[PDB]
Design a protein around this ligand. Structure first.
Ligand code: QEI
Ligand code: BR
Ligand code: BR
Ligand code: CL
Ligand code: CL
Ligand code: K
Ligand code: ZN
Length: 392
């Protein structure tokens, strides 16, 4: 009944890979899409303008870092979070509850919401589904995330089932609190941890609600890669095909390609930024460790196929010297490049899907990444074989 925000351009015959279009209030976004953090909280980070120049048409943004106390913040801006960020394209804004429960061990979770006491004076801050959705309505982001009860995937016990059912109840609360469904798209977040039955229950129950899209939560928490890819495959097997699948917290290139093969459409991770901080640059063969002296007299670019400004203007040797003379500017250049590599990777994946050659693409990618596609990690081989893709 409700209008679908996603159009399927193509689906490959073997895997679950999909190429599509998100039609959002600030423009169309090609999927599968990696979503960089547009929030400027980092002193060392790429700017919104450079993201626009790279071709990024949707990024992540929250106001958790602003203000006086921890939690999401109203900004009291006439143009909302888009005006605050000077961003003409699409924004995805999480609830802020994940950061509130992860960054502060003092914060506690009750059915009423996420509770915190002031570090300075013990002031009590409560983030309820109602408050989360009201803040997100004021911010005006294009896609807003349900407030959910997040538990560590390493945790086992009744707490997992408790959080799953609480996430369902909070999904209903957020749906009810959500004004402006004509301008913002609320996504549910599938919970259940590594328990197949709990996650299957969460799938069956959450897909009963007519929300524009669905996300897969509680993965990439230190769980085994077997459990990770099995949970992803379960989720996408039971999520509707005419709506987006957003897998939160995965940025490794191999994980991206594999989870595209499993049916995921949207991704996010701060991995490119962290990789840059080690003096490392992402390439089809993995990463170049530019601090090493084998690049001292290497005057080629990071990647002669890369279209990013760093590869247009600077060489490996310049970056190698800059890492040891001005680590910060080198970090900025490597950040630009790694984000451009993530975008270039997603674009090439989508192109391979549209041209009906995705399995050959995966084979080439694994060969370049690991030497020969049969040297691919065992978990990725299992995952790919589960949806009809064999290597070599
Ligand atoms: N709102 C929300 N934001 C998120 N970002 C990343 C996740 C990924 N799941 C995290 C939660 C527990 C697991 O150990 C993993 O570390 C996520 C979520 O599950 N919910
Ligand atoms: Br990023
Ligand atoms: Br040079
Ligand atoms: Cl809704
Ligand atoms: Cl060396
Ligand atoms: K805050
Ligand atoms: Zn580059």
């Amino acid at each position: 009944s409700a209008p679908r925000i996603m159009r399927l351009v193509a689906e490959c015959s073997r895997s679950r890979a999909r190429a599509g279009e998100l039609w959002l209030p600030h423009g169309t976004v090609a999927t599968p899409v990696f979503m960089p953090v547009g929030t400027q909280a980092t002193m060392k980070g790429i700017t919104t303008e450079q993201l626009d120049a790279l071709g990024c048409r949707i990024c992540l943004g929250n106001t958790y870092h602003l203000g006086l106390r921890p939690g999401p913040e109203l900004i009291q801006k006439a143009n909302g979070l888009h005006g605050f960020m000077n961003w003409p394209h699409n924004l995805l804004t999480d609830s802020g509850g994940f950061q509130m429960v992860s960054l502060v061990s003092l914060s506690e979770v009750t059915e009423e919401g996420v509770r915190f006491r002031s570090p300075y004076d013990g002031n009590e801050t409560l983030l309820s589904p109602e408050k989360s959705v009201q803040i997100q309505n004021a911010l005006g982001s294009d896609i807003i995330m349900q407030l959910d009860d997040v538990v560590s995937s390493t945790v086992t016990g009744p707490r997992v089932e408790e959080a799953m059912y609480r996430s369902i109840r909070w999904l209903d609360r957020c749906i009810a609190a959500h004004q402006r469904p004509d301008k913002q798209n609320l996504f549910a977040i599938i919970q259940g941890g590594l328990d197949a039955d709990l996650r299957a229950t969460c799938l069956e129950e959450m897909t009963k609600r007519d929300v524009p899209g669905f996300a897969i939560g509680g993965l990439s928490g230190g769980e085994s890669k077997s459990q990770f890819w099995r949970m992803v495959a379960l989720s996408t097997s039971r999520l509707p095909k005419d709506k987006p699948r957003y897998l939160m917290g995965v940025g490794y290139a191999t994980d991206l390609v594999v989870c595209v093969a499993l049916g995921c459409d949207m991704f996010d991770c701060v991995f490119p930024t962290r990789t840059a901080r080690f003096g490392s640059a992402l390439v089809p063969t993995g990463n170049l460790q530019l601090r090493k002296k084998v690049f001292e007299k290497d005057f080629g670019p990071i990647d002669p196929e890369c279209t990013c400004p760093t590869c247009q203007k600077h060489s490996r040797a310049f970056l190698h010297a800059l890492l040891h003379s001005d680590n910060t500017a080198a970090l900025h250049h490597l950040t630009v490049h790694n984000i451009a590599y993530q975008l270039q990777l997603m674009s090439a994946v989508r192109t391979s899907i549209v041209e009906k050659r995705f399995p050959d693409f995966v084979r080439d990618f694994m060969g370049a990444m690991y030497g020969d596609p049969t040297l691919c990690p065992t978990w990725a081989t299992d995952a790919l074989a589960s949806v009809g893709i064999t290597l070599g």
